[PDB]
C-alpha cells in the first residue's frame, strides 16, 4: 500500500559532549532526551543516548569531566561528527581552566575539522557571565580549520538549547 522503503541509509551521527565537571553535560543530555533530571550525580564514566529511526542512528556521548576522567576523553574521540563543549558560565574561576581543555581538544588530531558548539550553560543565574565575555576569554575567534559557534543556554530551563541544536543540525556533515 503506502509501505515505503524510504529509509535504508544506515547513517551514523556521533555527538560528543565534553567540558569540565559541574558544567551541566549530563543535565543537558537528559534534558535533550526528555528524561528525569531530579537526581544527577557526577558522571564516573559515560552516558549514551542512542536514538534510532530505521537504520539512522544518532549517538550522543556524555563523558565525565571529573579531574580523574578527563584523561580518558581521548579514548572517545574516534568518529565524532559534532563536539558540544559545555561551560559553567557562572564559575568564572574555572574559565581559564576550561579554556585550556578546549584548546587541547581543538589541537587533538583525532578531532580535526569537527564542528564545535560551545554551550555557555547556566545563563539562568545572575552571576552567569554573558556568552560574548566567555568567547573573549576562550579566544574563540582565533579558531581556524573548523566551524564553531557559542550559544547562551540554561540546561535547567531549556532556554537556548534548541538554538544550539539547530546550529548542530545545520552544520553537520562538516
Amino acid at each position: 500500500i503506502l509501505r515505503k522503503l524510504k529509509s535504508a541509509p544506515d547513517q551514523e551521527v556521533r555527538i560528543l559532549l565534553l567540558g569540565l565537571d559541574n558544567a551541566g553535560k549530563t543535565t543537558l543530555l537528559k534534558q535533550l532526551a526528555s528524561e528525569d533530571i531530579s537526581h544527577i550525580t557526577p558522571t564516573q564514566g559515560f552516558n549514551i543516548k542512542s536514538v534510532q529511526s530505521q537504520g539512522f542512528k544518532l549517538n550522543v556521548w556524555d563523558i565525565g569531566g571529573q579531574r580523574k576522567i578527563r584523561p580518558y576523553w581521548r579514548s572517545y574521540f574516534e568518529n565524532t561528527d559534532i563536539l558540544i563543549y559545555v561551560i559553567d558560565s557562572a564559575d568564572r574561576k574555572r574559565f581559564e581552566e576550561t579554556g585550556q581543555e578546549l584548546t587541547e581538544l581543538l589541537e587533538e588530531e583525532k578531532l580535526s575539522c569537527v564542528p564545535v558548539l560551545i554551550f555557555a550553560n547556566k545563563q539562568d543565574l545572575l552571576t552567569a557571565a554573558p556568552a560574548s565575555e566567555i568567547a573573549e576569554g576562550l579566544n574563540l575567534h582565533t579558531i581556524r580549520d573548523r566551524v564553531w559557534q557559542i550559544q547562551s543556554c540554561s540546561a535547567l530551563t531549556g532556554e537556548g538549547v534548541q538554538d544550539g541544536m539547530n546550529w548542530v543540525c545545520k552544520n553537520v556533515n562538516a
Binding site: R3, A33, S34, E35, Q44, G45, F46, N47, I48, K49, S50, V51, Q52, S53, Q54, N59, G64, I69, Y72, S75, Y76
Partner: protein, 171 residues
C-alpha cells in the same frame, strides 16, 4: 567457547542454550539498572535498579515481561541499561540484542561501547521508533504469549562474556 559477534548476527532465532557461563564474566561487569519508558508520553513503564533485584512470584540471568496490547501500538520507546566496570581494563565493550518471534527477526540493536573506564558506572538508553509491524505480526504476537523471545549478547574484544535472555508477552 569461541563465540564471535559475527557468528551471532547471522542467527535466525533464539538460541536453545546459553553460550557462556556466569564465570565467563571476568571483568566483573554488573548491570545495576534497567528502565523502559514510553518516550511519546514520558511514562516510565518499568524500572528496577540498585538494591532492588526482583519482584518474582540452569542460570540466573533470565527475565520476561508482559504488556497490554497497547504496547504494540506505541510510537517510540526508550530502554536504559546501567552497568559498572571493575579493576581490570576493558577495551571494546559491545552489545548485541536481538528480538525474534518464531524465527522472525523483529529488532536488532548492535552498539559498540568501546573503551570502558575502570571502576566506572555507565548508562546507555536505546531510543527506537517501534519496528514496522504488519497487523498480521500484531495478531500473532498478541495471541501467542512468550513466543516472542530475545537474546542479549555482550562481548569484550569480540569474545562473548555474558548472555541474558528474555521472553515478551502482550496479553
Amino acid at each position: 567457547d569461541t563465540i564471535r559477534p559475527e557468528h551471532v548476527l547471522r542467527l535466525s532465532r533464539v538460541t536453545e542454550n546459553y553460550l557462556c557461563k556466569p564465570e565467563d564474566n571476568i571483568y566483573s561487569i554488573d548491570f545495576t539498572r534497567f528502565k523502559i519508558r514510553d518516550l511519546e508520553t514520558g511514562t516510565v513503564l518499568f524500572e528496577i535498579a540498585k538494591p532492588c533485584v526482583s519482584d518474582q512470584e540452569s542460570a540466573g540471568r533470565f527475565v520476561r515481561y508482559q504488556f497490554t496490547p497497547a504496547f504494540l501500538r506505541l510510537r517510540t520507546v526508550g530502554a536504559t541499561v546501567e552497568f559498572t566496570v571493575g579493576d581490570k581494563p576493558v577495551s571494546n565493550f559491545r552489545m548485541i540484542e536481538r528480538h525474534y518471534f518464531r524465527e522472525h527477526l523483529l529488532k536488532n540493536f548492535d552498539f559498540d561501547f568501546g573503551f570502558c573506564i575502570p571502576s566506572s558506572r555507565n548508562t546507555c538508553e536505546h531510543i527506537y521508533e517501534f519496528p514496522q509491524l504488519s497487523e498480521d505480526v500484531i495478531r500473532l504476537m498478541i495471541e501467542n504469549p512468550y513466543e516472542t523471545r530475545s537474546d542479549s549478547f555482550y562481548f569484550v574484544d569480540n569474545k562473548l562474556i555474558m548472555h541474558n535472555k528474555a521472553d515478551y508477552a502482550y496479553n
